[PDB]
Write a protein that binds this ligand. Structure first.
Ligand SMILES: [Mg+2]
Ligand SMILES: [Mg+2]
Ligand SMILES: [Zn+2]
Ligand SMILES: [Zn+2]
Lengths: 49, 79, 277, 1173
RNA sequence: GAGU
DNA sequence: CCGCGTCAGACTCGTAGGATTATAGCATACGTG
DNA sequence: CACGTATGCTATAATGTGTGCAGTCTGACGCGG
């Protein structure tokens, strides 16, 4: 409903196709936060699974 | 089911798991086009699922049973 | 402890002795002949001049310290290009360099979008002219009034004044209240909404269905040539080379396929006609 | 895309270069003419990517036909424009520069690490003086500052063999060359010599710094920046407004300063410039960088032409305007609408009026999808144009979709969860939302222009969440106290009061009626009043031992009105409940009774029914407000003249110079207070029973049916207080000082105030109103802190298997049973039985939830006090068990595992304060305190502040021995029995002790009079003591304001305060002395120590205030998002801390699924995936 | 400026 | 202790767009159609 | 060659800043002297 760009478009198409499926991703504003922190000169990394 | 969900919650118990169970069932009806047990009486999928649970037709464990039954027969067909 | 950048710098410059003419000449003879000390002493002794001049040129260009550094750069050019043999004093010569360098710096850095010197100087004469005009016309000057004064095109004047349009901060809040600013109103116009994006999906997919209605040969020719189901918009020779030699036959099958699509549209075009908005 | 955890560590110069895809060497943004990005500039497309998708700049490569191609002509990669927000750059600084956050933001970090005072560092940085980096000659030591002239002396003398330098270079070098390992061991050696208290803290601080620095893998060099990162273009956009204007981020201006100064420095170095100029430029560089990172931190923030300080990088993370608070923990939302609300009396409880126009837009995609299934719309474009044209078939479709689809209604401020509730929408033509009356309570909604927000749950899962968890019908009871929040109000109460209330004979006294249907018939035929006393045959159902209902016919003595209401009453309930004259207070009990016996469905129907009949009869009554309704008592003027002669007496006694001004002031005030009480009594006697005007034999006395008295008596509206001002005397007003005016207002509102009375009223009125606007911030801030500290607490387990719990007594503060045992303990698990042979033979076994049944039995047996299982005493690590919590008060049964209890607790405690700060202040007017005094007391409690003059307590059991005195200051030479070594404590002279020495003293016996510090209570009398102190001391405030909150909520927060424990003595791990770790983790370690033996860890639990407890959570995202974000991030970056995202905060920030509620199932599935690899 |  | 500094200080809604200054004048030089 | 963009040089002597505002908020909690 907010940032998730891929999610919103995919969700819209799902809604038009009936299936009320959630296809969520990551809020773009979060991405931006990290970038803002790195521009600060703090290394903030995601350690993945 | 529609107005009050109390008896449906009394069947399953955990409200949150009732949500999950009815949603997984409603998703089946929505996507798979899986047949409803109770007469729709012109009602939406979610309402159907909640009625079914109230009357004690759907269950997390029962859903798991039909999943394996049918998937296993599909594997048998493959081989 | 005074940690003011400015005060510290001004104190340090103060403690270098001011030069007389004979001293400047002696030092400078050796400075041109390369005496690292000489150049340094002349520089350091004449820093105080730089600050006097940067004091004037500040105002609204830049920070005083920023002006001081650029001014120092001008002073260094002056020490390199000073002529001791000419009877003209150093301070006189240096003044020119310092003012020059400061002004040029405040003409490239003073604007977020870097304006070339040529544009800037053009624009300035339009400005000074506008001021004389307003001095006799009581009311401010129009584009065409300034243009009439210079005997020049109004478009010229207008384009210059458009460039003088100064920037707005995206973060500056609107309505006095420190709430929502420009960023808070400003959309992403490039990023279409899921409505537009989903309409294109629907479009592209309806074209697949329409392409399958046609002959296998027509559809494949169209797909490869348009670059629709293929990757690259293959030219007539590419498509022909992969199927049927006859480059000309690709044109034949292609044009044939377009016309069969028109028939589907005249029959079932009742949906297609609504794609005109 | 999906990760498990997130780490923060120091950014190395080299690491910053890794992120960068180009070095920005120019301030040029774009070209003035072709507004395209300038070479090596801040927006360089050769560096940050293409402006247009799959197009190079000069336009050589276009479309996907050229995928990853890099244009030879312009130098631009051809890819998605997306990347311009992703790709970072960098700048090579000629001179190193300090990172201001790791310099100015205290603790110093850089100063703390070198043990170098901050001033000292600064003198070095700004080139005021040199610092010795290595004086090989022991003659000159390390880190010893030399002034300019000091450097000249040793220059000739020692020289060579001492290296001392100036600026960021010096400090970086000093940092590089310090070996952390060695100096850690050296300082540990010194810690053993004579560790004084403050010395031990600072040493242990550097010890932990050095230790954490090596654990992080961070290097001290990195405190100093040589490479400076550049944020992506789209995150500091330069966009054109329509009108040919450009608008840019402030960051671009700040970066242009840095670049220009750095590049000038490179030029000055190429030219081999004199050193004073080199210095000025280095300072210049440092200034600009400091401004870039955190503007208004070091000095004057660099300002725009607007005067206003430019917004730096840190400002985007920091505070409310910051990322976290504004864009991450809370968001703008699609499928959301808003309008004015108005009443929907016709609505049933689970419904709301939803404007057609609004609903048409909110459900847009659902309508298009159904249009394609109907075959009505060929394509999406056609569907869109069909809805624009608003065709009649579209209305049928819209009607189809919205059936069974719940929508969420919200009202601001959202103080508790019931501020958002779900309803089935009922489409209405007309632009306002219609809200159901009975839930106006929870929303605090009154229709004086109020507005509400509407949200569309999209997914099958969200729709289910709305219908099951959030539906208004399902959520009746306050989660704060176990009370029904849906209760009739206003007109409804009034109407029910009207029907039930009796009058003397009236129409058809002493009739005999067959059933309540005959009654209704008679009333509406006009042969009987509603207040007619009558005999009626009612059949009342009493529910049996099992589900079967046993009915019983009885002739009762009631009014026609009561019989008719019995028709609304369900079978199951008794007739005597309605047989009384009904008011708001009786009707809440009615509803409660119905819930407990019948259940949810019946009560919901009953509530709606009551609403319909209530309003219905309210209208029929014809009840109104005329000036005659406000009755002034005849004896006003007499009472008043007497009071005036009285005041005159004290004034004359003053002029004589006998009685002081203060004595007279007090006596005048007492005279007028007493006069006021007297006039009010007169008014109420004359009004309440003014119906001295009756019948049948002869004259008789009865209750007044005056309109205002009815409103007030029913509890529908007004009260005696209000009516005092209307008909009585207004009374004494209080100044804005708080002091009371000597002259009171003798008039009332019906009488009308004169200029002076009106003026005098204003002060108090306005004081109140200002309090609403301004103090709600402080109340709400309390709400926020509570919420943040309770966040993580969830029901994790069914049964912890603990035997622990607190012994609740019935609160007989003074004498009156303030809170009966039953009400304090209902719906709690009994930890431990109590066998007292007794009357009803009650054991009541362990782990039994106290149902109303077992509670009734307690009263018959007269149970004294009871051990009840509690959140604080739970053994569950990382949450609490259902048993230790007990009933979910909002449900009326045992709490379900998964529920986010903490959040509920904080909301429940916070909300009343926040609301009462608006209630008795928009209203709070006349004086006969309030909340403005109370909440500071409450905040001082939750924050665990030690009081100004604290009581003293005995530390250890033994025998009290008094000793010596330092000129009156009491020393105490106390000597226990087994721990024979003496313990001494100095006491102030003027502080008098209540106990008298030489005594057998238990741990924590009160010596002095004064307030107890919660820490000291914890340290001496343990957890139950401090827990119960806070619960009781807090509840005193809320109790004074008539606010019901269950102890268990405050207990939740208390537990969160007691999260941490300082270890005093080494374990088998690397705990050792003075480290403070979470009690959960050290008890789990002790389970493994029990198994393995080894050295056991001796610890001691510590109490922490709410703010610090939230900042102490291992989750740094939770900490940083809460407050203090610059500091929190320096702490975590240096520690190299990783957050694995256990808490809700953390998940919400990354937009993931909450680990609680519905999300508990999925989250435990993920957790088992993590455990098996 | 609107309801707290 | 004192004193100076830093840190916090409710939720949604609204309205309206918007500001300023000024950088000489000319000669030579470098890159693209 | 031309057009747009850039660098360049000028010689009476002149050689240490300021400028425009800020309006003082508060109760709390640490940190050098
Ligand atoms: Mg109201
Ligand atoms: Mg209102
Ligand atoms: Zn190109
Ligand atoms: Zn437990």
């Amino acid at each position: 409903k907010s940032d998730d760009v891929n999610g919103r478009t995919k969700m819209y198409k799902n809604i038009v196709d009936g299936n009320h499926q959630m296809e969520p991703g990551m809020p773009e504003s979060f991405n931006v936060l990290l970038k803002e922190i790195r521009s600060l000169g703090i290394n903030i990394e995601l350690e993945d699974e | 089911a529609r107005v009050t969900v109390q008896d449906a919650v009394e069947k399953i118990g955990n409200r949150f798991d009732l949500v999950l169970v009815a949603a997984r069932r409603a998703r089946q009806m929505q996507v798979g086009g899986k047949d409803p047990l109770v007469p729709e009486e012109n009602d939406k999928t979610t309402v159907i699922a909640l009625r079914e649970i109230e009357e004690g037709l759907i269950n997390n464990q029962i859903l798991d049973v039909r999943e394996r039954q049918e998937q296993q027969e599909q594997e048998a067909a493959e081989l | 402890r005074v940690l003011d950048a400015t005060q510290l710098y001004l104190g340090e410059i103060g403690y270098s002795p001011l030069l007389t003419a004979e001293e400047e000449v002696y030092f400078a003879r050796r400075a041109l002949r390369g005496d690292v000390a000489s150049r340094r002493r002349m520089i350091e002794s004449n820093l105080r001049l730089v600050v006097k001049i940067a004091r004037r040129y500040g105002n609204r260009g830049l920070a005083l310290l920023d002006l001081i550094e650029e001014g120092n750069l001008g002073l260094i050019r002056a020490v390199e290009k000073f002529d001791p043999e000419r009877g003209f004093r150093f301070s006189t010569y240096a003044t020119w360099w310092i003012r020059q360098t400061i002004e040029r710096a405040i003409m490239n850095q003073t604007r977020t979008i870097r304006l070339p010197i040529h544009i800037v100087k053009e624009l300035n004469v339009y400005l000074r002219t506008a001021r004389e005009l307003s001095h006799k016309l009581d009311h401010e000057p129009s584009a065409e009034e300034i243009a009439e004064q210079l005997d020049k095109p109004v478009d010229d004047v207008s384009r210059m004044l458009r460039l003088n349009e100064r920037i707005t901060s995206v973060d500056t809040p609107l309505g006095g209240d420190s709430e929502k600013a420009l960023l808070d109103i400003l959309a992403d116009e490039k990023e279409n909404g899921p409505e537009d994006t989903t309409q294109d999906d629907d479009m592209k997919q309806s074209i697949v269905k329409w392409l399958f209605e046609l002959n296998a040969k027509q559809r494949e020719v169209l797909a490869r040539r348009f670059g629709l189901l293929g990757y690259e918009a293959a030219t007539l020779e590419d498509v022909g080379r992969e199927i049927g030699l006859t480059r000309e036959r690709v044109r034949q099958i292609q044009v044939e396929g377009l016309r069969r699509l028109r028939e589907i549209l005249q029959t079932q075009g009742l949906n297609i006609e609504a794609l005109f908005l | 895309e999906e990760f498990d955890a997130i780490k923060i560590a120091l950014a190395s110069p080299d690491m910053i270069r890794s992120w960068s895809f180009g070095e920005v060497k120019k301030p040029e943004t774009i070209n003035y003419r072709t507004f395209k990005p300038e070479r090596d500039g801040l927006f360089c497309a050769r560096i940050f990517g293409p402006v247009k998708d799959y197009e190079c700049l000069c336009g050589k490569y276009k479309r996907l036909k050229h995928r990853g191609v890099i244009c030879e002509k312009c130098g631009v990669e051809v890819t998605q424009t997306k990347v311009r927000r992703e790709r970072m750059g960098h700048i090579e600084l000629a001179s190193p520069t300090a990172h201001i956050w790791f310099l100015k933001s205290l603790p110093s970090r850089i100063g703390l690490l070198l043990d170098m005072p901050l001033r000292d560092i600064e003198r070095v940085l700004y080139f005021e003086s040199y610092v010795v980096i290595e004086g090989g000659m022991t003659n000159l030591e390390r880190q010893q500052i030399l002034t300019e002239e000091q450097y000249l002396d040793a220059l000739e003398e020692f020289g060579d063999e001492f290296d001392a330098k100036m600026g960021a270079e010096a400090i970086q070098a000093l940092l590089k060359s310090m070996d952390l390992e060695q100096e850690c061991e050296q300082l540990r050696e010194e810690l053993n010599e004579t560790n004084s208290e403050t010395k031990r803290k600072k040493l242990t601080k550097r010890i932990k710094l050095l230790e954490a620095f090596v654990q992080s893998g961070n290097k001290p060099e990195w405190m100093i920046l040589t490479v400076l990162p550049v944020l992506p273009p789209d995150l500091r956009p330069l966009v054109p407004l329509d009108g040919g204007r450009f608008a840019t981020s402030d960051l671009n201006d700040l970066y242009r300063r840095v670049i220009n100064r750095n590049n000038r420095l490179k030029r000055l170095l190429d030219l081999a410039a004199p050193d004073i100029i080199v210095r000025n430029e280095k300072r210049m560089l440092q200034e600009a960088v400091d401004a870039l990172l955190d503007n208004g931190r070091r000095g004057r923030a660099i300002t725009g032409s607007n005067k206003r300080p430019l917004k730096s990088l840190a400002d985007m993370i920091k505070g409310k305007q910051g990322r976290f608070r504004q864009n991450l923990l809370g968001k703008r939302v699609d499928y959301s609408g808003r309008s004015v609300i108005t009443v929907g009396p016709y609505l049933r409880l689970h419904q709301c009026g939803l404007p057609k126009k609004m609903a048409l837009e909110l459900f847009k995609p659902f309508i298009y999808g159904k249009l394609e299934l109907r075959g009505l719309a060929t394509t999406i474009k056609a569907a869109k144009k069909m809805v624009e044209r608003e065709e009649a078939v579209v209305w049928d479709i819209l009607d189809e979709v919205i059936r069974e689809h719940p929508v969420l209604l919200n009202r601001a401020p959202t103080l508790h969860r019931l501020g958002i509730q779900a309803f089935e929408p009922v489409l209405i033509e007309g632009k306002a939302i219609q809200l159901h009356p009975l839930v106006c309570a929870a929303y605090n909604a009154d229709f004086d222009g109020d507005q509400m927000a509407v949200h569309v749950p999209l997914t099958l899962e969200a729709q289910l969440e709305a219908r099951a968890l959030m539906m208004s019908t399902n959520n009746i009871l306050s989660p704060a106290n176990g009370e029904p929040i849906i209760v009739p109000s206003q007109d409804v109460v009034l109407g029910l009061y009207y029907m039930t209330r009796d009058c003397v004979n009236a129409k058809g006294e002493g009739m005999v009626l067959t059933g309540p249907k005959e009654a209704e018939r008679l009333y509406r035929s006009g042969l009987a009043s509603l207040h007619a006393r009558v005999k009626v045959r009612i059949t009342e159902y009493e529910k049996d031992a099992n589900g079967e209902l046993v009915a019983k016919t009885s002739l009762k003595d009631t009014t026609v009105g009561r019989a008719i209401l019995w028709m609304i009453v369900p079978k199951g309930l008794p007739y005597s409940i309605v047989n009384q004259a009904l008011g708001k207070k009786a009707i809440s009990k009615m509803l409660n009774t119905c819930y407990r016996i019948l259940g949810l469905k019946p009560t919901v129907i009953f509530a709606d029914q009551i609403m319909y009949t209530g309003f219905a009869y309210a209208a029929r009554s014809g009840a109104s407000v005329g000036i005659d309704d406000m009755v002034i008592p005849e004896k006003k003027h007499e009472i008043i003249s007497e009071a005036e002669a009285e005041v005159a007496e004290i004034q004359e006694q003053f002029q004589s110079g006998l009685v002081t001004a203060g004595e007279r002031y007090n006596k005048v005030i007492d005279i007028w207070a007493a006069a006021n009480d007297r006039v009010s009594k007169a008014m109420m006697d004359n009004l309440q029973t003014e119906t001295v005007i009756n019948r049948d034999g002869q004259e008789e006395k009865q209750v007044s049916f005056n309109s205002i008295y009815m409103m007030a008596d029913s509890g529908a509206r007004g009260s005696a207080a209000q009516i005092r001002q209307l008909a009585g005397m207004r009374g004494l007003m209080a100044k804005p000082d708080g002091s009371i005016i000597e002259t009171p207002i003798t008039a009332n509102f019906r009488e009308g105030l004169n200029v002076l009375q009106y003026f005098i009223s204003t002060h108090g009125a306005r004081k109140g109103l200002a309090d609403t606007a301004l103090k709600t911030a402080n109340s709400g801030y309390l709400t926020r802190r509570l919420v943040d500290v309770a966040q993580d607490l969830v029901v994790t387990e069914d049964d912890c298997g603990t035997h622990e719990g607190i012994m609740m007594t019935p609160v007989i503060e003074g004498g009156d049973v303030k809170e009966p045992l039953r009400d304090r303990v209902l719906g709690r698990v009994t930890a431990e039985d109590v066998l007292k042979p007794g009357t009803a033979d009650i054991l009541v076994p362990r782990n039994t939830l106290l149902h109303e049944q077992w509670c009734d039995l307690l009263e018959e047996n007269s149970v004294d006090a009871v051990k009840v299982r509690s959140v604080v005493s739970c053994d569950t690590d990382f949450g609490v068990c259902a048993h230790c919590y007990g009933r979910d008060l909002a449900r009326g049964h045992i709490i379900n595992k998964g529920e986010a209890i903490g959040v509920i607790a904080a909301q429940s405690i916070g909300e009343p304060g926040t609301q009462l700060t608006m209630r008795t202040f928009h209203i709070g007017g006349a004086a006969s305190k309030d909340i403005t005094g109370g909440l500071p007391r409450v905040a001082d409690l939750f924050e665990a502040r030690r009081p100004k003059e604290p009581a003293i307590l005995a530390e250890i059991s033994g025998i009290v021995s008094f000793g010596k005195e330092t000129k009156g200051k009491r020393r105490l030479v106390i000597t226990p029995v087994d721990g024979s070594d003496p313990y001494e404590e100095m006491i102030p002279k003027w502080r008098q002790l209540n106990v008298f020495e030489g005594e057998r003293v238990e741990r924590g016996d009160v010596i002095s009079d004064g307030p107890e510090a919660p820490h000291d209570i914890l340290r001496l009398r343990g957890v139950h003591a401090v827990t119960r102190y806070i619960v009781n001391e807090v509840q005193d405030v809320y109790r004074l304001q008539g606010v019901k909150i269950n102890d268990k909520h405050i207990e939740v927060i208390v537990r969160q305060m007691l999260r941490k424990a300082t270890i005093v003595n080494a374990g088998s791990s690397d705990f050792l002395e003075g480290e403070q770790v979470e009690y959960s983790r050290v008890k789990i370690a002790n389970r493994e120590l029990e198994a393995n033996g080894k050295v056991g860890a001796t610890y001691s639990r510590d109490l922490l205030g709410i703010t610090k407890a939230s900042l102490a959570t291992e989750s740094f995202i939770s900490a940083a998002s809460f407050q203090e974000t610059t500091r929190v991030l320096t702490e975590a970056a240096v520690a190299g801390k990783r957050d694995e995202l256990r808490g809700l905060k953390e998940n919400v920030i990354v937009g993931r699924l909450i680990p609680a509620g519905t999300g508990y199932a999925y989250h435990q599935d993920r957790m088992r995936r993590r455990a098996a690899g």
